[PDB]
Amino acid sequence: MNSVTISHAPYTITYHDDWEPVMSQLVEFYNEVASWLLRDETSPIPDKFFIQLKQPLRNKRVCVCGIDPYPKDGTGVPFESPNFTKKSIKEIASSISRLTGVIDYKGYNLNIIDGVIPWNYYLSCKLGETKSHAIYWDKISKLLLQHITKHVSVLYCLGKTDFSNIRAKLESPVTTIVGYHPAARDHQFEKDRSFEIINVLLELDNKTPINWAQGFIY
Amino acid sequence: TSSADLTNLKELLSLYKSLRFSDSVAIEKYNSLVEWGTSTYWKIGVQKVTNVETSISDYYDEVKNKPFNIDPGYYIFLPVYFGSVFIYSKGKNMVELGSGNSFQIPDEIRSACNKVLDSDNGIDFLRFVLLNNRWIMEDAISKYQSPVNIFKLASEYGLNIPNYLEIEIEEDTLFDDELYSIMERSFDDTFPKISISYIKLGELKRQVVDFFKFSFMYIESIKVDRIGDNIFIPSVITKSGKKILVKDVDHLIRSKVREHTFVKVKKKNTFSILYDYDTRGEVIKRIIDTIGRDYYVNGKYFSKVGIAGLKQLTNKLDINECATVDELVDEINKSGTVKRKIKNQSVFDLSRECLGYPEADFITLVNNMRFKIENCKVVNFNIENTNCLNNPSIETIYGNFNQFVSIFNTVTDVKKRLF
Amino acid sequence: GMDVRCINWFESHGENRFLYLKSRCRNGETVFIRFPHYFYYVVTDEIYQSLSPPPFNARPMGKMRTIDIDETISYNLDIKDRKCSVADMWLIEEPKKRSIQNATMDEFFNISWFYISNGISPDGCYSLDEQYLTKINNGCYHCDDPRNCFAKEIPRFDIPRSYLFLDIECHFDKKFPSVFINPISHTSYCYIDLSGKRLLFTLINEEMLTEQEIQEAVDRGCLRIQSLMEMDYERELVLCSEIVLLRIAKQLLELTFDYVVTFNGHNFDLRYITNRLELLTGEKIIFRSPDKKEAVHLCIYERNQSSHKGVCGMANTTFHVNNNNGTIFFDLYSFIQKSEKLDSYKLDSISKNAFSCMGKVLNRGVREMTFIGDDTTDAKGKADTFAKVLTTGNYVTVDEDIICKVIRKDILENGFKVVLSCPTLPNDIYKLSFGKDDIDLAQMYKDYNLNIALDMARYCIHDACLCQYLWEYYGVETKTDAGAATYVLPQSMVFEYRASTIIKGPLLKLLLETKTILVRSETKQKFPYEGGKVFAPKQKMFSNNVLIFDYNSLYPNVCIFGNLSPETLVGVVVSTNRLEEEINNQLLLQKYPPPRYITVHCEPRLPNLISEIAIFDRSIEGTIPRLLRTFLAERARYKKMLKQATSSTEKAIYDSMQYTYKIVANSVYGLMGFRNSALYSYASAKSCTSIGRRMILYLESVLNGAELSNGMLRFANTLSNPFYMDDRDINPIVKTSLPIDYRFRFRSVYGDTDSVFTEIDSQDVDKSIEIAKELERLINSRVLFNNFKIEFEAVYKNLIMQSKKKYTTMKYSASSNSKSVPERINKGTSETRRDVSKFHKNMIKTYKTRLSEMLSEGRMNSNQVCIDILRSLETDLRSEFDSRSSPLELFMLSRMHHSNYKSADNPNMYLVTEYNKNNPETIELGERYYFAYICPANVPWTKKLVNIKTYETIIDRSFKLGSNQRIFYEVYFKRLTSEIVNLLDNKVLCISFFQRMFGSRPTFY
DNA sequence: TGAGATTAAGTTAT
DNA sequence: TTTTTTTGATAACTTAATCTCA
Ligand SMILES: Nc1ccn(C[C@@H](CO)OCP(=O)(O)OP(=O)(O)OP(=O)(O)O)c(=O)n1
Ligand SMILES: [Ca+2]
Ligand SMILES: [Ca+2]
Ligand SMILES: [Ca+2]
């Protein structure tokens, strides 16, 4: 739960002790890019950059990874919006409410679920357009994903072509599932049977099963 | 990702759950599925296995040789037979304890096992005991049904089962020798059972108990006894005429029993059993010399080399005796069941089974020979390497090669017309 | 556009997917043609009417036969015939992808289907008619029926081409250029337009130069522009700001060039230019489709290629540029790395290896040295290439060790005349190469001035022109045209696929011509199979002439001779015992007579089997033999083209192309035994290997101990076919045209797959060559049969065979004599290996030459040779250990980085990972790097070596051996001593010396 | 504290 | 506002690290 300071707007690096061999290199990886990153207006909150780096990562067994925060608005944590309107979150919630058996809900908020953590590959975005900050975050995203992979047992990513080069991105082998994005034509995410896959992979790797309907918010 | 991958990997998980209860086919399937999983997902929690030692002690407690106090639940009683033990996990062959040997089921036992196991999926495996070329219903471990109804259904399918008795005990009564003797008398079951393993309701694990007294005796002679058509069982006698049962030939080989020498034999109230855990080339010829040159070790039993002609061919094909080849073809084409079996089998295998030769020994003897074959028939044979003749079994088999070649020629000639 | 010639083919990646063709007319104008691209499926006539959504288009393919090529094992001679079914087929075109269940021929590409079905070659000249063309833009046309539009083909005609060879130089302070903090200093362009004009111009960022320096440069004649519109390409040096520089670069990159050529520019140059453009200004490099309908931004994408052996893993990486305008962006680094094998793949190494010549001393000087070159000094064409590179060259390497600045140059009409700056080398003939320089870019950037800026501009334009020199030297345009013609692929993807993909075009053409479809259903179990046979050498030193006879295209010719194809395999018969084996052999010898069938005895695939016979039918030609015949014809044509060449560059290009086609023909066989291939055939590969082994055994048996005397030649064994009886004379007495006074004897000494080494009890070189020619003539008509032909390779002298695959010798070619100069050749020894040393090979050569001479003169009256050789070794080793005068370069090792390892704790993984985590220069997944053993200096000589890999460190480009760090000479000395010991005969002294110097037991071969 | 065999990796000839 | 096409074989030698045996 410690923190370190830098010479750039966010300078709010509150991090946990189990994230120790990350910050000492993230400082140099971010100093050379913050000057050009902070010259534009983004659509996360600028203080919401190093907010998931203080959580204990040796508690989760499956990691769901996003490629980019919402092009419009944004909170700071992936796949969370207590203003439920978006199509991707609707498609995510429908196919899991059918599986679990709960029909009455007011959103999902996947972050609160124990044993899973939502991850955003690119820690920043811009209003109106997506994937407009890839160059500023490429090496940082590589290092962060490598560290997260080193601790978790199975990784889940959204986007076939968007995550088509993830095997070379990591040097340590790991169980990886790359799923179709829930915005493509024909709604292919309906056919995506991946939550059962990741669960049964947890039982196959002698890990404690993770309840999935816990995160529902009423 | 897809449903097919989910089914494949969940079948892999199910196979991983039952790993000790596997044979060559199941090991190959498990390895292939592990390879597919680690190729698709870049990592899998389980690895490859090649040895896979068969262990059953995880479901059975340590043996008990002392009177003990009991009171939990009902007391369904189940005896343990003496002999080789085989395991039928699911739709497989018989697996021997330790080494994963694949026993050759005749026919009816495999069908009975398949029909018993097809009823449900809560049974862990099926346990069988073979003694002097016969099967018996051993312990039926199951996580869904109590073994009583498995025993009843197995009995009504066509195989034999031991009787069961249920008694309720209130206080912690001290089970002793007298209760064991009384319940084994009430079991009847004249077959030479060694131990008794009663189940415990609620507790999934089973328990085994047996009481015995050590003894030392003297060896008089070793003799073979007929228990079938060219199947012989070894046996020994004492001064008073007591019979010491031997489970199989391998037990005698490992015991290294010597004629006119004192031995240690485990004695019980009814019958006594020689104790193992006392080289191989010396005994494998010494016992053969003592019991007679005209004998050989047919796998688990003893077999006698004799005459081989029309009678053996008719007996193996389950047909009546005849005189000439025309009667042979008529009697084997009259029923369409036998001719289909003959068509699906080769001449070499059919003749080898007709004469009851071993597999590996006969194959090596044939591979260490030379033949002159004309019109798909054998007319001249000779030995090229005499090293393989060192084994007494090889010499005993080779001494009657004329009968084998006559049977081979007859079968080839008849199959030339059966097509 | 009536008479057009194709340049490139590309696709549209929008919602409305289109295919495009770029072409040029005779006058020089560019024409773009558009087609609607579909998805192609092949169905049966019965399936065709059972499609609830009617197909958009369907074309009848005629009647074709489908054959199951699954292989089964038979324990007897009751083999069922192969399942084949003849039916009418339909080729259906769908605007969007479908999911037909029972669809065949699904292993071919859609662009391949377009080419083959429409009858259009990727490269060629056509007469497009205006009936099927409609104008949609200025220069862009639309076509709905490409089959009818391309019905007329015309002979090839030459067309002008546009080239952009570009290089950049970025300022770097300590470690590496960073796009966020380090700017671009120089940008050099070689610009060639459709008018043939060749303009060389360099742009210099003026923000790194002082105002007085800018004034001095503009007085000297450097243009100082202020905006984009004030730039002219007719000047040589242009001073400008970084924003204007990037805007000019973006403007040049958006033009419709035929080729944009870099060296490692897809990973560094283009990415840097782009990222700087969006950082400083925010603009984008916009690429547009020919119809101006879909526009994309420049974004370099990575393509990872995985291995195929022992857990695949990532094996190589490439970087490509997305563009929809028909321009081909080419990186020479990837092309050279994929096609060549070298110690290093840097620009300096490739330039030194390619641009070399022989110079004759003509003048001396106090510190200068004048050379000269022409066709009289070196081979024809070398001097011209050296002069062409010398136009922009600045530094020359002499004797592969001296780096010298060029003082003055003078291009002649036949060669070059250059004066260098080196001491007076006291010889007459030397070697001049274009290689490494002695310029420290880090130091020059720290003291940046006007003169240093001009020097950097000259170096940058030299690199940009070196791109063009390597483009012309390697024949990339000719190779691209040949690959597009042969593989039936667009020009932009000729060098992007391996053998599994480049054969699908000709395979589909052959399948359509033969009207055959191959299907497999059962799974493919994998079993190892035996390979070729290598004979054990009989002697180490021979002192006699050895004659070499080599089979021509052994495995393709074996497949052609045996008709080895998956669909022609009658069956496989296996046996468990000798009775069944003999019965099956008796039945088989009469059931399948060998005028039509061929039976191959292979090793059993399972331990329980003792025999395995593969039966093949030669009545109908197989699919694989036809492809092999096509590739052999191609290779023969390219060899004929090679033999009629006089220039060095043309000869090198033709040799490379014929080698590529030979490797393709071999890869056809290799894929026939590849499990993950559609042409998988275990039995065919086993049969081909067995037949090759039989052929080499037959040659060795017939050649061993075959003396000649008078006019007769007597072979050892009868000239009988080793497979079946044939209509040839088997008498080993052969009339020869050699004179009557010749008497010699032969003895086979070695063999490898298809090569036979036959020695002769003679020393006269002309005599041996004449006898070898006569024998090669004689053993091709009387000994061999059908399509089996061998050729006499060369004569070997001073043959020193260390092992079964390593030997060094002097080579006399077929067209040579006694006075002809030999060529020293090494095969597998510690002189061609890329990871032994440089200090090692020179000593190995010297000691081997000394040993050969000393054995030739006559020695071995005592221990003798060992004593003096070990004394020399001790003296040299102690001198090297004390003086330490050798540079670090002589003790450098090379290794390729890859991610194919059984365990994640491998030291090779750890070394590269740790280097990458602490160095901005990142080693890619297929990059070859340098490493060496370095130990603390205070450590004295070590007798017992414990750990070796822990001392490995990567010497990227600028590592400095500090005072505390020294080269760990122990490993190199131990390896050298171990290699030398195995050459000698006496042992006791060898083990004694190894124990004394190091303290171990020297292993003996 | 040595000898010997075995496995993994790199590299070349064919 | 997100998505189709890959992948030649075996044989022989050398060196370091690991396992096993006097
Ligand atoms: N790339 C290769 C190289 C060699 N071989 C083994 C064998 C068959 O290809 O080599 C025999 P050759 O017939 O190709 O003969 P070689 O390689 O010497 O070629 P050539 O001198 O005829 O050009 C192979 O299988 N693949
Ligand atoms: Ca450069
Ligand atoms: Ca340069
Ligand atoms: Ca050859």
PDB file of N, CA, C and O and ligand atoms in Angstrom, chain C residues 550-554 754, ligand 4:
ATOM      1  N   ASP C 550      28.626 -38.552 -57.887  1.00  0.00           N
ATOM      2  CA  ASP C 550      27.471 -38.029 -57.167  1.00  0.00           C
ATOM      3  C   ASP C 550      26.206 -38.214 -57.990  1.00  0.00           C
ATOM      4  O   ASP C 550      26.188 -37.897 -59.183  1.00  0.00           O
ATOM      5  N   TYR C 551      25.152 -38.718 -57.350  1.00  0.00           N
ATOM      6  CA  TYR C 551      23.849 -38.817 -57.994  1.00  0.00           C
ATOM      7  C   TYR C 551      23.246 -37.433 -58.205  1.00  0.00           C
ATOM      8  O   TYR C 551      23.423 -36.523 -57.391  1.00  0.00           O
ATOM      9  N   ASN C 552      22.517 -37.284 -59.308  1.00  0.00           N
ATOM     10  CA  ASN C 552      21.868 -36.027 -59.658  1.00  0.00           C
ATOM     11  C   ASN C 552      20.410 -36.075 -59.218  1.00  0.00           C
ATOM     12  O   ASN C 552      19.638 -36.898 -59.720  1.00  0.00           O
ATOM     13  N   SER C 553      20.038 -35.186 -58.295  1.00  0.00           N
ATOM     14  CA  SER C 553      18.670 -35.083 -57.784  1.00  0.00           C
ATOM     15  C   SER C 553      18.155 -36.450 -57.333  1.00  0.00           C
ATOM     16  O   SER C 553      17.216 -37.011 -57.900  1.00  0.00           O
ATOM     17  N   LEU C 554      18.803 -36.981 -56.294  1.00  0.00           N
ATOM     18  CA  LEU C 554      18.593 -38.375 -55.913  1.00  0.00           C
ATOM     19  C   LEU C 554      17.146 -38.645 -55.519  1.00  0.00           C
ATOM     20  O   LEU C 554      16.515 -39.565 -56.045  1.00  0.00           O
ATOM     21  N   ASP C 754      24.279 -40.309 -51.387  1.00  0.00           N
ATOM     22  CA  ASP C 754      24.392 -40.604 -52.808  1.00  0.00           C
ATOM     23  C   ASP C 754      25.786 -40.385 -53.378  1.00  0.00           C
ATOM     24  O   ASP C 754      25.970 -40.574 -54.584  1.00  0.00           O
TER      25      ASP C 754
HETATM   26 CA    CA F   4      23.520 -35.514 -55.951  1.00  0.00          CA
END
